[PDB]
Amino acid sequence: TEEYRIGEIFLAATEENKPQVFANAEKIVEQLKQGGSFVAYARQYSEASTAAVGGDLGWIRLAQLPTELATTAASMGPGQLAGPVEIRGGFSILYLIDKREGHHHHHH
Numbered sequence: 834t835e836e837y838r839i840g841e842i843f844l845a846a847t848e849e850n851k852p853q854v855f856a857n858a859e860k861i862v863e864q865l866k867q868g869g870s871f872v873a874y875a876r877q878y879s880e881a882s883t884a885a886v887g888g889d890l891g892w893i894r895l896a897q898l899p900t901e902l903a904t905t906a907a908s909m910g911p912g913q914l915a916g917p918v919e920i921r922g923g924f925s926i927l928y929l930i931d932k933r934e935g936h937h938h939h940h941h
Contacts, residue, residue, distance in 0.1 A: 835894075836892045836932070837892070838932065839927055840889055841888045842858075842871070842879045843924070844925075845922050845923040846924065855924055858926060862916060862926055871887065871888065901919060911931070912929060
């Protein structure tokens with residue numbers, strides 16, 4: 834019943850350019866782990882339509898994510914960064930902003 838508030842920075846890459854784009858993504862992860870604003874980096878680097886909103890995907894269920902990201906998100910601890918994670922069209926960096934669960938809504 835878990836729902837996840839996830840932030841994402843997506844960098845597109847053809848198979849030929851993947852190693853290079855992975856390098857670019859890793860440098861971003863390094864800056865984020867050292868304190869950089871996820872929103873700022875997402876607005877500057879994300880190639881997904883959510884870039885403008887700081888990469889915030891809002892509250893989502895894991896089935897909404899591609900397998901690679903869903904399985905990564907399932908093991909993440911709150912407030913942590915993950916990636917870069919390879920997906921068919923490139924690489925994604927994830928940020929677990931919030932998390933909630935429970936079979937009953939009136940319990941929050």
